[PDB]
Amino acid sequence: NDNITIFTRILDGLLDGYDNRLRPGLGERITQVRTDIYVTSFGPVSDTEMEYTIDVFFRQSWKDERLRFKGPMQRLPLNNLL
Amino acid sequence: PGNMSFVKETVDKLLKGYDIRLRPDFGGPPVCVGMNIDIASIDMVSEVNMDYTLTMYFQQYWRDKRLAYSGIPLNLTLDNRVADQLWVPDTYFLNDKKSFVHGVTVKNR
Amino acid sequence: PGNMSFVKETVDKLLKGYDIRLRPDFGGPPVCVGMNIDIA
Amino acid sequence: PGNMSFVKETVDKLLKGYDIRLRPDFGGPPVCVGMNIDIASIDMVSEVNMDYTLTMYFQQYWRDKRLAYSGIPLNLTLDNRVADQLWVPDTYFLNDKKSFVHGVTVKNR
Ligand SMILES: *[C@@H]1O[C@H](CO)[C@@H](O[C@@H]2O[C@H](CO)[C@@H](O[C@@H]3O[C@H](CO)[C@@H](O)[C@H](O)[C@@H]3O)[C@H](O)[C@H]2NC(C)=O)[C@H](O)[C@H]1NC(C)=O
Ligand SMILES: *[C@@H]1O[C@H](CO)[C@@H](O[C@@H]2O[C@H](CO)[C@@H](O[C@@H]3O[C@H](CO)[C@@H](O)[C@H](O)[C@@H]3O)[C@H](O)[C@H]2NC(C)=O)[C@H](O)[C@H]1NC(C)=O
């Protein structure tokens, strides 16, 4: 009953004053972006244009210190509009 | 007072504070998205491309306890532009190569 | 008058409080929409 | 530690009051835009179409006094959405037939 309210409160309190123009750790650290690919399908290859099509899930991960939070659960699936 | 202003204020009260960034019953049990399809046509099938073109009316159906309203017996139908103000499932077609929602006059939603 | 300010404050009074989400005469009888086409 | 807030407020101070409409030193001497191109590849060259297709990295340099800052020694890289918040030259290719900026994951700016 209360979670869908306390998490909107948390998230609104999580990105107020948050600036997305800046890297996480802009002033102190290099940002290590862990990356991964799942190839859903490969091809077709084109000999005449010398190209090939590939369809993938492209996955990235990094740590943004601004967004660490405390709450009843340890992982939030957010709407991609965020 | 009156239906027009009454309905306007009811919808505003529904959407006031509605967080699109959280799914229905967030944190609780999963939301069940029932869906059904009416096929307009399969337009063409191509061996050289190993694909086919499908046109369909695609529909989805779920509860959002936040959008429950009282005092109005009607099934409210709203302009499609409300779709950008509501949470909707992230449904997608895995083997889709290329697709689009029809947009003549106004986007077909 | 022909004052453009008079027209502006007239249009703004039409749009103020206007809700695009609700059809004309909502809850009432259906809206009659008259189609017309000129073929190019 | 406090650098994050410091640089945030620095950038906000730069943008606050900044006018997109006016070129650097508007009314004063012209702005010098220096350009570089790194050719990625040249696609098909067509006699039948009397055209050729080119892919490149295209870079432009200019100085805008409104964006000077002193507290941060870094060459400050910013997310590409800032380009919509800054004046940028209206360079265009006078002999192009069809062209686009790449957007593979984010628009390549
Ligand atoms: C608002 O829409 C709902 C549907 O979302 C309408 O409720 C549905 O009304 C129909 C009758 O118009 C009900 O059908 C009946 O159902 C049973 C089987 O469940 C069967 O014995 C009958 O032959 C008949 O088909 C239907 O059950 C009911 N519910 C659903 C989920 O479809 C409602 O009438 C609409 N209200 C207004 C004011 O338009
Ligand atoms: C931020 O970017 C600027 C861009 O101008 C960097 O300036 C760099 O300054 C150095 C030092 O003057 C330039 O070195 C050049 O080297 C050769 C000798 O090796 C000589 O021919 C030139 O007289 C000149 O000194 C360098 O060209 C210049 N640009 C670049 C791209 O390095 C500056 O270093 C950057 N700062 C930081 C903190 O990253």
Short mmCIF file of C-alpha atoms and ligand atoms in Angstrom, two decimals:
data_model
loop_
_atom_site.label_atom_id
_atom_site.label_comp_id
_atom_site.label_asym_id
_atom_site.label_seq_id
_atom_site.Cartn_x
_atom_site.Cartn_y
_atom_site.Cartn_z
CA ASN A 1 0.00 0.00 0.00
CA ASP A 2 2.74 2.45 1.00
CA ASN A 3 5.66 1.39 -1.22
CA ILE A 4 4.41 3.02 -4.42
CA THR A 5 4.25 6.28 -2.45
CA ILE A 6 7.51 6.08 -0.51
CA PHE A 7 9.43 5.26 -3.69
CA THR A 8 8.02 8.24 -5.58
CA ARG A 9 9.05 10.28 -2.54
CA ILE A 10 12.53 8.70 -2.56
CA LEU A 11 13.11 9.11 -6.29
CA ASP A 12 11.86 12.71 -6.29
CA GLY A 13 14.28 13.21 -3.40
CA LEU A 14 16.96 11.36 -5.37
CA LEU A 15 17.25 13.57 -8.48
CA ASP A 16 16.39 17.03 -7.16
CA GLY A 17 19.40 19.15 -8.01
CA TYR A 18 20.82 16.17 -9.90
CA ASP A 19 22.67 17.39 -12.99
CA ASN A 20 22.78 14.98 -15.93
CA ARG A 21 25.25 17.13 -17.88
CA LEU A 22 28.04 15.81 -15.61
CA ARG A 23 29.72 12.42 -15.39
CA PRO A 24 29.51 10.42 -12.17
CA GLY A 25 32.85 11.13 -10.56
CA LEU A 26 33.63 13.92 -13.03
CA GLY A 27 36.23 15.51 -10.77
CA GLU A 28 37.89 12.51 -9.13
CA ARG A 29 37.64 9.24 -11.06
CA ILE A 30 37.50 7.49 -14.40
CA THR A 31 34.05 6.04 -15.11
CA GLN A 32 34.32 2.30 -15.75
CA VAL A 33 31.37 1.28 -17.95
CA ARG A 34 30.93 -2.48 -17.81
CA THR A 35 29.49 -3.60 -21.14
CA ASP A 36 27.99 -6.74 -22.64
CA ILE A 37 26.25 -7.87 -25.84
CA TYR A 38 23.61 -10.51 -26.57
CA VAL A 39 23.36 -11.18 -30.31
CA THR A 40 19.68 -11.88 -30.94
CA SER A 41 20.39 -12.61 -34.61
CA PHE A 42 23.33 -12.23 -36.98
CA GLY A 43 23.09 -11.30 -40.64
CA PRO A 44 22.24 -11.03 -43.43
CA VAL A 45 25.61 -10.10 -44.98
CA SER A 46 25.70 -8.03 -48.17
CA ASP A 47 28.57 -8.59 -50.60
CA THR A 48 27.69 -5.70 -52.92
CA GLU A 49 27.44 -3.04 -50.17
CA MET A 50 30.15 -4.75 -48.08
CA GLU A 51 28.01 -4.51 -44.93
CA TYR A 52 26.27 -6.84 -42.49
CA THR A 53 23.23 -6.41 -40.26
CA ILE A 54 23.30 -7.50 -36.62
CA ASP A 55 20.50 -7.41 -34.03
CA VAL A 56 21.53 -7.25 -30.38
CA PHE A 57 20.62 -6.42 -26.83
CA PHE A 58 23.34 -3.93 -25.88
CA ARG A 59 23.90 -3.80 -22.12
CA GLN A 60 25.87 -1.27 -20.06
CA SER A 61 26.44 -0.77 -16.34
CA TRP A 62 28.17 1.81 -14.14
CA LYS A 63 27.99 3.30 -10.65
CA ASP A 64 26.56 6.80 -10.14
CA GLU A 65 27.18 7.87 -6.55
CA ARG A 66 24.43 10.51 -6.69
CA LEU A 67 21.78 7.78 -6.87
CA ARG A 68 22.59 5.51 -3.92
CA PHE A 69 19.48 5.09 -1.80
CA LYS A 70 18.03 3.26 1.19
CA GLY A 71 14.61 1.62 1.12
CA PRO A 72 12.60 -1.57 1.61
CA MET A 73 14.09 -3.29 -1.46
CA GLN A 74 17.49 -3.33 -3.12
CA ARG A 75 16.71 -2.98 -6.84
CA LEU A 76 14.27 -0.73 -8.71
CA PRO A 77 13.03 -1.40 -12.26
CA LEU A 78 12.31 2.12 -13.49
CA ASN A 79 10.31 3.28 -16.49
CA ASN A 80 12.69 3.98 -19.36
CA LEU A 81 11.27 7.52 -19.56
CA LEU A 82 13.51 8.18 -16.55
CA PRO B 1 -20.84 21.39 -11.23
CA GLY B 2 -22.18 19.67 -14.34
CA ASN B 3 -20.79 16.62 -16.12
CA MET B 4 -18.14 18.44 -18.16
CA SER B 5 -16.46 20.22 -15.24
CA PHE B 6 -17.15 17.30 -12.90
CA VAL B 7 -15.43 14.87 -15.27
CA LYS B 8 -12.58 17.32 -15.85
CA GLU B 9 -11.90 17.63 -12.13
CA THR B 10 -12.24 13.86 -11.63
CA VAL B 11 -9.60 13.16 -14.29
CA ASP B 12 -7.37 15.90 -12.87
CA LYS B 13 -7.67 14.34 -9.40
CA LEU B 14 -6.71 10.99 -10.92
CA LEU B 15 -3.65 12.38 -12.71
CA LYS B 16 -2.56 14.76 -9.93
CA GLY B 17 0.58 13.15 -8.54
CA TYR B 18 0.36 10.11 -10.83
CA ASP B 19 3.93 8.78 -11.08
CA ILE B 20 4.42 7.30 -14.55
CA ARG B 21 7.83 6.06 -13.40
CA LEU B 22 6.30 3.34 -11.18
CA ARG B 23 4.25 0.41 -12.51
CA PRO B 24 0.83 -0.45 -11.05
CA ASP B 25 1.16 -2.03 -7.60
CA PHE B 26 4.89 -1.28 -7.67
CA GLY B 27 6.78 -3.44 -5.20
CA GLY B 28 3.79 -5.75 -4.84
CA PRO B 29 2.60 -8.68 -6.94
CA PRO B 30 3.02 -8.41 -10.72
CA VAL B 31 0.43 -6.61 -12.82
CA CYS B 32 -1.35 -8.96 -15.24
CA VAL B 33 -1.48 -7.52 -18.77
CA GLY B 34 -4.18 -9.29 -20.73
CA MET B 35 -3.98 -8.69 -24.47
CA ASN B 36 -5.74 -9.65 -27.69
CA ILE B 37 -5.31 -8.95 -31.39
CA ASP B 38 -7.44 -8.27 -34.46
CA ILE B 39 -5.41 -8.82 -37.63
CA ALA B 40 -6.04 -6.30 -40.39
CA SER B 41 -3.90 -8.23 -42.89
CA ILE B 42 -0.63 -9.97 -43.61
CA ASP B 43 0.53 -7.74 -46.43
CA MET B 44 3.41 -9.59 -48.10
CA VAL B 45 5.76 -12.53 -47.54
CA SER B 46 9.30 -12.48 -48.94
CA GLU B 47 11.78 -15.34 -49.25
CA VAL B 48 14.61 -13.05 -50.40
CA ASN B 49 14.18 -11.00 -47.20
CA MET B 50 13.06 -13.92 -44.97
CA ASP B 51 10.34 -11.72 -43.49
CA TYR B 52 6.65 -10.84 -43.67
CA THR B 53 4.62 -7.69 -43.06
CA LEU B 54 1.74 -7.77 -40.56
CA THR B 55 -0.85 -5.07 -39.84
CA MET B 56 -2.94 -5.50 -36.71
CA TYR B 57 -5.01 -3.85 -34.01
CA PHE B 58 -3.01 -4.63 -30.86
CA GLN B 59 -4.66 -4.17 -27.47
CA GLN B 60 -3.62 -4.47 -23.82
CA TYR B 61 -5.67 -4.59 -20.64
CA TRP B 62 -4.57 -4.15 -17.03
CA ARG B 63 -5.59 -2.75 -13.64
CA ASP B 64 -4.15 0.48 -12.27
CA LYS B 65 -5.55 1.01 -8.78
CA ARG B 66 -4.45 4.65 -8.97
CA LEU B 67 -6.89 5.30 -11.84
CA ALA B 68 -9.97 3.99 -10.03
CA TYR B 69 -12.74 6.58 -9.88
CA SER B 70 -16.18 6.81 -8.29
CA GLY B 71 -19.37 8.79 -8.77
CA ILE B 72 -19.37 8.31 -12.56
CA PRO B 73 -21.04 5.16 -13.98
CA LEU B 74 -19.63 5.58 -17.49
CA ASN B 75 -16.59 3.91 -19.01
CA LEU B 76 -14.57 7.06 -19.65
CA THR B 77 -12.95 7.20 -23.08
CA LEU B 78 -10.23 9.83 -23.39
CA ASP B 79 -8.25 11.46 -26.18
CA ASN B 80 -5.31 9.28 -27.16
CA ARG B 81 -2.83 11.94 -25.99
CA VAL B 82 -3.51 10.77 -22.42
CA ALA B 83 -1.33 7.79 -23.34
CA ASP B 84 1.77 9.94 -22.82
CA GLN B 85 0.54 10.74 -19.29
CA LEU B 86 -0.06 7.13 -18.16
CA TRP B 87 2.07 4.11 -17.39
CA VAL B 88 1.82 1.45 -20.10
CA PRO B 89 3.52 -1.93 -20.46
CA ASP B 90 6.92 -2.20 -22.13
CA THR B 91 5.57 -4.74 -24.62
CA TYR B 92 7.71 -5.33 -27.71
CA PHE B 93 8.09 -7.80 -30.57
CA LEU B 94 11.37 -9.71 -30.38
CA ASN B 95 11.54 -10.78 -34.04
CA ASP B 96 10.31 -7.42 -35.39
CA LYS B 97 12.62 -5.97 -38.04
CA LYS B 98 10.75 -2.71 -38.67
CA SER B 99 7.42 -1.38 -37.39
CA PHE B 100 5.49 1.81 -36.77
CA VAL B 101 2.26 3.01 -35.19
CA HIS B 102 -0.02 4.58 -37.78
CA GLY B 103 -0.16 8.36 -37.54
CA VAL B 104 -2.52 9.82 -40.15
CA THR B 105 -4.79 12.56 -38.79
CA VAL B 106 -3.68 11.63 -35.26
CA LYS B 107 -1.66 8.76 -33.84
CA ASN B 108 -3.77 5.59 -33.88
CA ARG B 109 -4.08 4.85 -30.16
CA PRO C 1 -12.85 46.45 -32.38
CA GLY C 2 -10.05 45.23 -34.65
CA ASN C 3 -7.47 45.48 -31.86
CA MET C 4 -5.17 42.46 -31.90
CA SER C 5 -4.98 42.59 -28.10
CA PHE C 6 -8.77 42.30 -27.97
CA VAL C 7 -8.56 39.16 -30.12
CA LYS C 8 -5.70 37.74 -28.04
CA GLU C 9 -7.60 38.10 -24.76
CA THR C 10 -10.61 36.53 -26.51
CA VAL C 11 -8.70 33.45 -27.68
CA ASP C 12 -6.96 33.08 -24.32
CA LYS C 13 -10.37 33.01 -22.63
CA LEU C 14 -11.41 30.17 -24.95
CA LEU C 15 -8.30 28.10 -24.19
CA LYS C 16 -8.18 28.87 -20.45
CA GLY C 17 -9.60 25.82 -18.69
CA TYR C 18 -9.98 23.97 -21.99
CA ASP C 19 -9.33 20.23 -21.73
CA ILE C 20 -8.16 18.45 -24.88
CA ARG C 21 -8.82 15.07 -23.22
CA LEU C 22 -12.63 15.46 -23.31
CA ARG C 23 -14.74 15.52 -26.46
CA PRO C 24 -17.32 18.27 -27.08
CA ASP C 25 -20.54 17.79 -25.12
CA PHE C 26 -18.89 15.02 -23.11
CA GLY C 27 -21.44 12.73 -21.50
CA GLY C 28 -24.10 14.22 -23.75
CA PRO C 29 -25.25 13.14 -27.21
CA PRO C 30 -22.72 12.23 -29.91
CA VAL C 31 -20.64 14.85 -31.70
CA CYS C 32 -21.72 15.29 -35.32
CA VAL C 33 -18.59 15.48 -37.49
CA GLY C 34 -19.10 16.47 -41.11
CA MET C 35 -16.54 15.04 -43.52
CA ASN C 36 -15.60 16.72 -46.79
CA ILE C 37 -12.89 15.92 -49.33
CA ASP C 38 -11.34 17.57 -52.37
CA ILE C 39 -9.34 15.05 -54.40
CA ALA C 40 -5.95 16.34 -55.55
CA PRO D 1 34.45 15.87 -2.74
CA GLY D 2 32.84 19.30 -3.13
CA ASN D 3 33.98 19.60 -6.75
CA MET D 4 30.71 18.17 -8.07
CA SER D 5 28.58 20.95 -6.60
CA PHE D 6 31.24 23.51 -7.50
CA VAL D 7 31.28 22.55 -11.18
CA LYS D 8 27.48 22.20 -11.28
CA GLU D 9 27.03 25.76 -10.01
CA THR D 10 29.78 26.96 -12.36
CA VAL D 11 27.93 25.56 -15.38
CA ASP D 12 24.61 26.91 -14.10
CA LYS D 13 26.17 30.35 -13.69
CA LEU D 14 27.44 30.15 -17.27
CA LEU D 15 24.06 29.15 -18.71
CA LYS D 16 21.93 31.41 -16.50
CA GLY D 17 21.13 34.48 -18.58
CA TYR D 18 22.70 32.97 -21.71
CA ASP D 19 20.80 33.83 -24.90
CA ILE D 20 20.66 31.24 -27.67
CA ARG D 21 19.62 33.88 -30.19
CA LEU D 22 22.85 35.91 -30.25
CA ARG D 23 26.18 34.86 -31.73
CA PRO D 24 29.37 35.51 -29.75
CA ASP D 25 30.29 39.20 -29.75
CA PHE D 26 27.05 40.09 -31.53
CA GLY D 27 27.42 43.48 -33.17
CA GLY D 28 31.19 43.24 -32.74
CA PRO D 29 33.77 41.57 -34.98
CA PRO D 30 32.91 38.27 -36.67
CA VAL D 31 33.47 34.98 -34.87
CA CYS D 32 36.17 32.68 -36.29
CA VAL D 33 34.94 29.08 -36.61
CA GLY D 34 37.83 26.67 -37.16
CA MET D 35 36.90 23.31 -38.65
CA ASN D 36 38.34 19.81 -38.89
CA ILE D 37 37.13 16.72 -40.74
CA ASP D 38 38.20 13.12 -40.11
CA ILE D 39 37.03 11.03 -43.05
CA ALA D 40 35.63 7.71 -41.85
CA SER D 41 34.95 6.34 -45.34
CA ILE D 42 33.54 7.22 -48.75
CA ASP D 43 30.57 5.06 -49.73
CA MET D 44 29.41 4.32 -53.28
CA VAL D 45 30.46 6.72 -56.05
CA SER D 46 27.65 6.75 -58.61
CA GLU D 47 27.95 7.84 -62.23
CA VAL D 48 24.25 7.16 -62.78
CA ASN D 49 23.24 9.43 -59.88
CA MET D 50 26.15 11.88 -60.34
CA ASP D 51 26.79 11.83 -56.60
CA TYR D 52 28.86 10.20 -53.88
CA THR D 53 28.15 9.36 -50.24
CA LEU D 54 30.56 10.39 -47.48
CA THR D 55 30.80 9.56 -43.76
CA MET D 56 32.95 11.71 -41.50
CA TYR D 57 33.62 13.20 -38.09
CA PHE D 58 33.06 16.95 -38.44
CA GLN D 59 34.39 19.30 -35.78
CA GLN D 60 34.10 23.06 -35.21
CA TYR D 61 36.04 25.35 -32.88
CA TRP D 62 35.11 28.87 -31.78
CA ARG D 63 35.52 31.06 -28.69
CA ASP D 64 32.51 32.40 -26.79
CA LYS D 65 33.43 34.76 -23.94
CA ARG D 66 30.11 34.00 -22.23
CA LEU D 67 31.34 30.47 -21.41
CA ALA D 68 34.63 31.31 -19.68
CA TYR D 69 35.23 29.76 -16.26
CA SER D 70 38.16 29.85 -13.84
CA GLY D 71 37.58 27.61 -10.82
CA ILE D 72 37.85 24.31 -12.72
CA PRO D 73 41.10 23.58 -14.64
CA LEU D 74 39.57 20.73 -16.66
CA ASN D 75 38.66 20.79 -20.32
CA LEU D 76 35.03 20.24 -19.36
CA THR D 77 33.14 17.66 -21.42
CA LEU D 78 29.36 17.93 -21.09
CA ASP D 79 26.44 15.73 -22.09
CA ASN D 80 25.42 16.46 -25.66
CA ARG D 81 22.03 17.91 -24.68
CA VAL D 82 23.95 21.09 -23.79
CA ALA D 83 24.25 21.75 -27.53
CA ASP D 84 20.55 22.64 -27.52
CA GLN D 85 21.32 25.16 -24.75
CA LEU D 86 24.19 26.90 -26.59
CA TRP D 87 24.72 28.96 -29.71
CA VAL D 88 26.28 26.87 -32.48
CA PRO D 89 27.11 27.90 -36.03
CA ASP D 90 24.61 27.21 -38.82
CA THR D 91 27.14 25.50 -41.08
CA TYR D 92 25.56 23.52 -43.91
CA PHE D 93 26.80 21.55 -46.91
CA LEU D 94 25.81 23.50 -50.00
CA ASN D 95 26.11 20.58 -52.46
CA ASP D 96 24.60 17.78 -50.36
CA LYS D 97 21.59 15.79 -51.59
CA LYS D 98 20.64 13.80 -48.48
CA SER D 99 22.42 13.66 -45.13
CA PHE D 100 21.85 12.84 -41.47
CA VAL D 101 23.61 12.90 -38.11
CA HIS D 102 24.10 9.49 -36.54
CA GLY D 103 22.01 8.39 -33.57
CA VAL D 104 23.07 4.80 -32.97
CA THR D 105 22.46 5.00 -29.21
CA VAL D 106 22.50 8.76 -28.58
CA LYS D 107 22.72 11.46 -31.21
CA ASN D 108 26.40 11.65 -32.16
CA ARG D 109 27.20 15.15 -30.91
C1 LIG E 1 -17.98 -0.81 -19.25
O1 LIG E 1 -17.22 -1.85 -19.82
C2 LIG E 1 -17.37 -3.11 -19.20
C3 LIG E 1 -16.35 -4.05 -19.81
O2 LIG E 1 -15.05 -3.52 -19.64
C4 LIG E 1 -18.81 -3.60 -19.35
O3 LIG E 1 -19.04 -4.73 -18.53
C5 LIG E 1 -19.46 -5.89 -19.28
O4 LIG E 1 -20.81 -5.82 -19.66
C6 LIG E 1 -21.25 -6.90 -20.46
C7 LIG E 1 -22.65 -6.62 -20.95
O5 LIG E 1 -22.69 -5.40 -21.65
C8 LIG E 1 -21.15 -8.22 -19.68
O6 LIG E 1 -21.38 -9.31 -20.54
C9 LIG E 1 -22.09 -10.42 -19.93
O7 LIG E 1 -21.17 -11.31 -19.32
C10 LIG E 1 -21.47 -12.67 -19.02
C11 LIG E 1 -20.16 -13.46 -18.98
O8 LIG E 1 -19.30 -12.81 -18.07
C12 LIG E 1 -22.53 -13.35 -19.89
O9 LIG E 1 -23.42 -14.09 -19.07
C13 LIG E 1 -23.44 -12.44 -20.73
O10 LIG E 1 -23.79 -13.01 -21.97
C14 LIG E 1 -22.88 -11.04 -21.07
O11 LIG E 1 -22.03 -11.07 -22.19
C15 LIG E 1 -19.73 -8.38 -19.14
O12 LIG E 1 -19.64 -9.47 -18.26
C16 LIG E 1 -19.28 -7.13 -18.39
N1 LIG E 1 -17.92 -7.30 -17.93
C17 LIG E 1 -16.85 -7.45 -18.74
C18 LIG E 1 -15.53 -7.62 -18.02
O13 LIG E 1 -16.92 -7.46 -19.96
C19 LIG E 1 -19.79 -2.52 -18.90
O14 LIG E 1 -21.10 -2.84 -19.28
C20 LIG E 1 -19.46 -1.14 -19.49
N2 LIG E 1 -20.31 -0.14 -18.91
C21 LIG E 1 -20.88 0.87 -19.59
C22 LIG E 1 -21.73 1.80 -18.77
O15 LIG E 1 -20.73 1.04 -20.79
C1 LIG E 2 42.87 21.25 -22.86
O1 LIG E 2 42.88 21.36 -24.27
C2 LIG E 2 43.88 22.22 -24.78
C3 LIG E 2 43.60 22.48 -26.24
O2 LIG E 2 44.39 23.57 -26.68
C4 LIG E 2 45.26 21.62 -24.51
O3 LIG E 2 46.27 22.52 -24.92
C5 LIG E 2 47.50 21.88 -25.34
O4 LIG E 2 48.60 22.61 -24.87
C6 LIG E 2 49.87 22.06 -25.18
C7 LIG E 2 50.93 22.84 -24.44
O5 LIG E 2 51.14 24.08 -25.06
C8 LIG E 2 50.09 22.03 -26.70
O6 LIG E 2 51.30 21.35 -27.00
C9 LIG E 2 51.87 21.58 -28.31
O7 LIG E 2 52.98 20.71 -28.44
C10 LIG E 2 54.04 20.87 -29.38
C11 LIG E 2 55.30 20.25 -28.79
O8 LIG E 2 54.98 18.95 -28.34
C12 LIG E 2 54.27 22.28 -29.93
O9 LIG E 2 54.38 22.24 -31.34
C13 LIG E 2 53.17 23.33 -29.65
O10 LIG E 2 53.70 24.62 -29.43
C14 LIG E 2 52.25 23.06 -28.44
O11 LIG E 2 52.83 23.47 -27.23
C15 LIG E 2 48.93 21.28 -27.35
O12 LIG E 2 48.94 21.39 -28.75
C16 LIG E 2 47.57 21.81 -26.87
N1 LIG E 2 46.53 20.99 -27.45
C17 LIG E 2 46.38 19.67 -27.22
C18 LIG E 2 45.22 19.03 -27.94
O13 LIG E 2 47.10 19.02 -26.48
C19 LIG E 2 45.39 21.37 -23.00
O14 LIG E 2 46.56 20.65 -22.70
C20 LIG E 2 44.20 20.60 -22.44
N2 LIG E 2 44.27 20.53 -21.00
C21 LIG E 2 43.98 19.44 -20.27
C22 LIG E 2 44.13 19.62 -18.78
O15 LIG E 2 43.60 18.39 -20.75
#
